[PDB]
Symmetry: D2
Subunit: 112 residues, 4 copies
């Protein structure tokens, strides 16, 4: 069966949800660009932890046990959340930036 993502939330949805979440807690002050970047590095660390001891031969993440799948979902999400937060705090239009980068990626690697 095809794997797909759910159609929502969108990146804008996530931006808004996170901005609201921060604003309700008066956390704007903690969400400066370098704080968010360091938090992002922390989350990439947590994501790496999930993979660090995995052998080549053992089951891959598509087949990980329930607890490990939950962890993987959560850390992938933490990374995305801070990345969205950081892009928003820098006034970067992340969806349109990705389109531009994908276009550049196509040029740098022609199908050839």
């Amino acid at each position: 069966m095809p794997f797909r993502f759910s159609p929502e939330p969108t990146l804008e949805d996530i931006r808004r949800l996170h901005a609201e979440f921060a604003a309700e807690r008066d956390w704007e002050q903690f969400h400066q660009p370098r704080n968010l970047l360091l938090a992002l590095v922390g989350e990439v660390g947590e994501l790496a932890e999930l993979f660090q001891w995995k052998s080549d031969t053992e089951p891959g993440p598509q087949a990980w046990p329930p607890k490990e799948r939950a962890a993987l979902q959560e850390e992938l999400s933490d990374v995305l959340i801070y990345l969205v937060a950081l892009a928003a705090r820098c006034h970067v239009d992340l969806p349109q930036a990705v389109i531009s980068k994908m276009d550049t990626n196509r040029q740098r690697y022609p199908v050839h």
Copy 2:
């Protein structure tokens, strides 16, 4: 004026675009979960490079010069692209995972 992200592309759009991009180049084989994770770490490194020498007093990323804004857009995008690729390769529904994580974030930090 309000800052917002463009409404598209969505995360599914990005998943599809990237999957197509990889498939046209026969790059599936290089896109194993640990490859994608290491590539993601590389991109977070590139993003860090943009910030590493910034003083506290100098202009923040909202006011960076054109070349630096372009770089910032591009690396934020590279991070997102690999994160999407990795989540997809692990069969994680990244948008719905984020909703779940945001719900958990609300519980762990009640507005209080």
Copy 3:
């Protein structure tokens, strides 16, 4: 007062200590280069966590409370341990690699160019 590191352990000492530690536990198999690299990334993450919510204006790490200083020591050490392990597992002579890199750094940034 001038700050300095202790004269030992050296990087070789740390290589040996870690190799001893791994070998007693039969952990060689877990210490392939990409495992060690990913573990290193994890530790850099833990180190970053300690700094992530520090403001610009507030006191630096020299003034952090005992628990935070202990954490900082521990994560800096975890990073170094894996870095040594990884360099060893790749047969890189890490101390001499640093000499070579410092020499390269001097050339890329001559004093009279800043």
Copy 4:
């Protein structure tokens, strides 16, 4: 044949060399703890780039070509240099911190528990 690191430079030697290097260029101001941490993350990124597209099956770093080995040496060194600089800037005695962490590691993972 048994692999070992050179006996020097030591971590103190590297601290001094980096401090000399920075001071000649008047780079102190750029070497605040969070700058050094972010620079470290950048270098871990460069190190990861070297491994990112390596397959599971293909030869390990011991067999990489001369250019890739040089890069590996250089990035491992950049990581260590910033790590030393950061530890020094935080007044952490990095060699003794590693001793303490190794002792902690032994307790958290006793041999008879694996």
